[PDB]
Amino acid sequence: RKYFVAANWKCNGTLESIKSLTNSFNNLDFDPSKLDVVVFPVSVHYDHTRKLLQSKFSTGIQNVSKFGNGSYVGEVSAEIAKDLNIEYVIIGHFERRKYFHETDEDVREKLQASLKNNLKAVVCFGESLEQREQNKTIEVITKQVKAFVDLIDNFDNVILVYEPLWAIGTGKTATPEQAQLVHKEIRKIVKDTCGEKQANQIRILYGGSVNTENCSSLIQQEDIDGFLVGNASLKESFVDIIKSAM
Template sequence: MRRRLAAGNWKMNGTGAALSELDTLTATHPSPTVDILICPPATLIHQAAQAVQGSGVAIGGQDCHAEVSGAHTGDLSAEMLKDAGATSVIVGHSERREDHGEKDDDIRAKARAAMNAGLTAIICVGESLEQREAANTLDIIGGQLSGSIPDLATGENLVVAYEPIWAIGTGKVPTLEEIGEVHDFIRARLDRRFGEGVGRSVRLLYGGSVKPDNAAEIFGVSNVDGALVGGASLKARDFSGIISALEQA
């Protein structure tokens, strides 16, 4: 059975004062029945990892470089993230694809670096509103899956997050049928490429305006193993409601 995962992406939010939210989160969920992951800004990873030590909460990064080291000013390698206390790293988020021009090849290289460093790569895929309205969603997702996932992926080192770009931070959410269609499609693609053993063990997350009041119905959809949450993960009380919904799903 795949263990469900509630992952929070703090994006470019939070200074040291925000670590108190982790204290609240670990106190509220001392023995969670799902995996909980918080991906804070890189400046907080080491402190966050220390703050949650011994709890049911893990810490991840929001991006990594494809190289182990070198002349890459401002970048962080997967090894550096792991050394700071991260267990996972998000790669290929739509904000990285759009703001930094990252392509599938770049994301595959970053994911490979993460896996080689012993991190779980959370690879994001998703379509724009224009692509959704043109009925190109599955073609776009299929291309991103083929181009972004390295061949060394397993159920232990890969998580796939479906995040429709038009639903991120907008309050808009796809219908449950639309979410289910994409998640079933992703599962089938993973089964076909890696075999059912690996394909069935990879966790699939949904992301895009997930909140405590809509989480339960989303978690009831086929092949949704959890969520990658943005804004609602910044406050422990909001994220706790999503975690509880996942535990009860």
């Protein structure tokens, strides 16, 4: 299996800052047959960003509709994405769950729509501080993974992300050991549900706070296969995070 490092730009960017960033990213010589690197711009920046990135980079969108084509103002169907050859989607990011009411039922339906339309999916989950303090880390992640995991067909084409919500905006910091222990448990869930071969094929990314300070200690953990990176991916120095995985 390949390392997978993803830039989640969230709701950030200008036309000119993207020109500069993409140029910086293009200057990194890496081997895309070894390493998957994926950039997730804002929807209205996707075309702009794709045209600026060399083919060694994959691209995707940050969210996708559970509905197909039709009378759904504001939504981008998986069918539309397919017609544009958008390669990846993010599903279940904690911000969609938090601010926009996204449920486990929505995650499932979105994954089903995406795979049906040959989109590859980066699917996010993870537990809160209150949950982790009640020793519910495994309970919660098990429940969240089992909402969708039976849909996975090609285990190269769904990528899991662990988001330690307990260490996001709480004042707590996840250690690499603590991230590793969770990732090993995620892998065990996949092994038990889908198989040994499948569990050894699937990528499980760390999607907590990732930056130039901590990327090395995380990426070298046995069951951490890369990152879904937030604000550090809006920087030229994101190339060093890519390097950590090379």
